[PDB]
Design a protein around this ligand. Structure first.
Ligand code: HEM
Ligand code: HEM
Ligand SMILES: C[C@H](O)[C@H](O)[C@H]1CNc2nc(N)[nH]c(=O)c2N1
Ligand SMILES: C[C@H](O)[C@H](O)[C@H]1CNc2nc(N)[nH]c(=O)c2N1
Ligand SMILES: NC(=[NH2+])NCCC[C@H](N)C(=O)O
Ligand SMILES: NC(=[NH2+])NCCC[C@H](N)C(=O)O
Ligand SMILES: [Zn+2]
Lengths: 411, 407
């Protein structure tokens, strides 16, 4: 069953066959689309089949499908699973796995870079201090003095679900958020809950508007431990505008390395609950969402004032005018300081090329339009005009519940 | 069964039960989401009429009354007899209003109950259609104080006697393919602009030439008619700061009137049902003016603004986009022609969603179409989870007539 997607701006039509290999569910039915919904211990029984599908894809990728090496690997894993109820991936398989989870991430517009992922194998890690060390190395390698490199660090996989490794932070680097008694929020509102947990764990909060949070790391199902990332390892960019000299006076800045650290990486049935990964920012992430979401730093009003914009009536599009400026400032500041960053026009054009390539060389490219289209200037980016098919392939990156909601504290 | 949708900016959570009354398909499956795809018998008829009549009577608090049973029986007999049926006026009006109520891609539905319905089922010729359409346009335009309306021509019978408005909108600008290879006017209408000529229209070959109506009645071939210019309200586009803006030579019409859709009520198909409301600014400023395959005007505007168009990262396209859309809203307002900005419109939709959830148990909505084409996340709908599903009565797409007509 073939399926075609059309780009209404170029009339280019593509045919998708890859969706046929999709096994997981979407959340949608023939009766309802849940396309805009944010979030719509395994058994030996269910493990080997997942393992075989993976190994089959892996061996095909290296052109050794059906070889003796392939067959022996299946036999070996089968035995190991029956013998230990789980199995260990070879280094080669882990790298292939991690790269494909990124390749299969439908919400990611930066996937044209998927094959260049640097994979750090932290499966020999046993303690939080060990985790802290791997994480520091990942940040230094990835930051590369501003010339960012994509990377992922993979800690030991889940076993019985009672010895999980977890990074409690949502990103390796992020700013604290503090709820004030007058109801206002100091810092980043998105991290208030986590910030409270850190303080409760012993962190001495400096209580400023841009305090880098400490790492709260959990190894082998133990209680999480706090660690401060060496400041010299955290690259930050002061935000200023190329034409407005007062912009710098807003005292804004952001970190250069975006590193999601709360997702779960699934490979051949195995679950890697601590798999922090990083790339580089697309401007709008900071400029539109982190700075202008009403629930984030919410700086639109203050910026519009300084610009002396008609804020009497929305139809003056004062919000839209200020948004552009703020986004111009983010891109400008990063570029001046030579910290890697990509604007939405450039990133989306690249994704379209990546997508076309994938259809031609792979038979498709699962993509989530709701997420792919930038939060500003939607239709002036090619992705808006591009029809997309969203479906779940493994290996994959999945959401998981915040650990403070599931953790059995030991004291 | 009972689905919940959350607004991530306000934490407000709504529970959707209305979807349980969904009847049509979405194009999606448990294995694949096609949410961004633009276009995913007497025995057949009676159940549909029944479903409709039941909701109709339920709506008037006479569910299961004699009147209900009676009407049900009457239509039933009429169908078994005529193989079809006719809606009472009350039912026609309710059907049309609800078709708008159920249009998941429309962000202006808070106005659904105020729809003026013009019953043109007694129409029989293209001239007749032209007359009905002129009246609709004048009524809806109302000197700039726009009023929503829909005119409903005769329903389908055998499919060989269909009424159809060939234009895609009652009022639209012509598009001509020049030797240069480039396109003059509106590229979206290059083709239709040709079928008119292939029919006799004397194209003034301009940038904003109001197209002619090409009307099809009872199945016969379509005819051309020039809408009285005094009936076409237009707005000269100028900027409230860039005097050079007016120089751009831009203008647009004030009445958006989709004319190529099909209205389905109780199984009955109305293939010619033009309807109009009023514009949301971005429709013109972002889509019509800046789409690459439309009037594609960003470069010129950026130029005049003297912006650094060397690097995409200077965001000249975005800056220009903003100014343009400022000018559309400014013009319309200055000429007292109804128009709504995407901020005000989206705020209204959120309120409408809430009302709909509490008074009806839900509101089918297509996020991909609801979120405006610019400044997405600074509008509230961006942060609003939505459930898309098909409820009837509804407005459906249908093949362009020139790809089905047997001259
Ligand atoms: C090279 C630079 C990269 C760019 C420019 C890029 C861009 C983006 C953007 C703009 C988003 C949406 C983020 C949001 O709205 O919160 C995103 C999402 C995503 N990306 Fe990428 N990305 C990059 C690298 C990576 C890497 C290295 C991985 C994985 C190995 C990855 C995995 C994902 C996933 C799984 C999501 C969805 C996360 C969620 O659901 O919250 N990306 N990316
Ligand atoms: C009163 C003012 C109204 C406003 C502000 C409004 C706004 C909008 C907007 C912004 C769109 C998207 C247009 C596009 O992208 O092409 C839309 C679509 C739609 N609206 Fe409304 N609308 C209004 C009245 C109407 C009326 C009166 C009806 C029908 C009775 C209606 C039916 C629909 C339908 C069926 C669609 C989707 C059409 C398609 O698929 O191309 N709208 N509306
Ligand atoms: C409710 C809606 O799904 C939600 O606000 C989505 C929309 N698109 C998005 N797109 C990206 N890239 N990131 C997001 O966080 C979101 N949020
Ligand atoms: C391919 C994609 O579905 C297409 O470009 C959609 C996106 N969202 C839209 N939203 C609205 N309101 N109108 C449109 O025409 C579209 N086009
Ligand atoms: N380009 C990326 N790798 N993004 C990861 C998500 C970062 C998140 N959206 C932020 O604004 O901090
Ligand atoms: N507001 C409306 N009723 N719009 C109907 C569709 C009009 C179309 N989007 C246009 O720009 O011409
Ligand atoms: Zn769907």
């Amino acid at each position: 069953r073939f399926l075609k997607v059309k780009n209404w701006e170029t009339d280019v039509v593509l045919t998708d066959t890859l969706h046929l290999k999709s096994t997981l569910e979407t959340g949608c039915t023939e009766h309802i689309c849940m396309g805009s919904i944010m979030l719509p211990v395994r058994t030996k029984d269910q493990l080997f089949p997942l393992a075989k599908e993976f190994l089959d894809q892996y061996y095909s990728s290296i052109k050794r499908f059906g070889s003796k090496a392939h067959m022996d690997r299946l036999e070996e894993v089968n035995k190991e699973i029956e013998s230990t109820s789980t199995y260990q991936l070879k280094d080669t398989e882990l790298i292939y796995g991690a790269k494909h989870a990124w390749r299969n991430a439908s919400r990611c517009v930066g996937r044209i870079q998927w094959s260049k992922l640097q994979v750090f194998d932290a499966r020999d890690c046993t303690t939080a201090h060990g985790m802290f060390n791997y994480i520091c190395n990942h940040v230094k390698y990835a930051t590369n003095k501003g010339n960012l490199r994509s990377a992922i660090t993979i800690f030991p996989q889940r076993t019985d679900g009672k010895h999980d490794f977890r990074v409690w932070n949502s990103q390796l680097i992020r700013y604290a958020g503090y709820k004030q008694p007058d109801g206002s929020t100091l810092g980043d509102p998105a991290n208030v809950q986590f910030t409270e947990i850190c303080i409760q764990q012993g962190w001495k909060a400096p209580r400023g508007r841009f305090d880098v949070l400490p790492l709260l790391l959990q190894a082998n199902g133990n209680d999480p431990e706090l660690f401060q990332i060496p400041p010299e390892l955290v690259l930050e960019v002061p935000i200023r505008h190329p034409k407005f000299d007062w912009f710098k006076d807003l005292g804004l800045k952001w970190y250069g390395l975006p590193a999601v650290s709360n997702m779960l990486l699934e490979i051949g049935g195995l679950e890697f609950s601590a798999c922090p990964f990083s790339g580089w920012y697309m401007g709008t992430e900071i400029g539109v969402r982190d700075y202008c979401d009403n629930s984030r730093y919410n700086i639109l009003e203050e910026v519009a004032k300084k610009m002396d914009l008609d804020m009497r009536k929305t139809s003056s599009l004062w919000k839209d005018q200020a948004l552009v400026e703020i986004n111009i400032a983010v891109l400008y500041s990063f570029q001046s300081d030579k910290v890697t960053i990509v604007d939405h026009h450039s990133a989306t054009e690249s994704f379209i090329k990546h997508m076309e390539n994938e259809y031609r060389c792979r038979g498709g490219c699962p993509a989530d339009w709701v997420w792919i289209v930038p939060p500003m200037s939607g239709s002036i980016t090619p992705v808006f005009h591009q029809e997309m098919l969203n479906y779940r392939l493994t290996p994959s990156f999945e959401y998981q519940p915040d650990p403070w909601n599931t953790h059995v504290w030991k004291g």
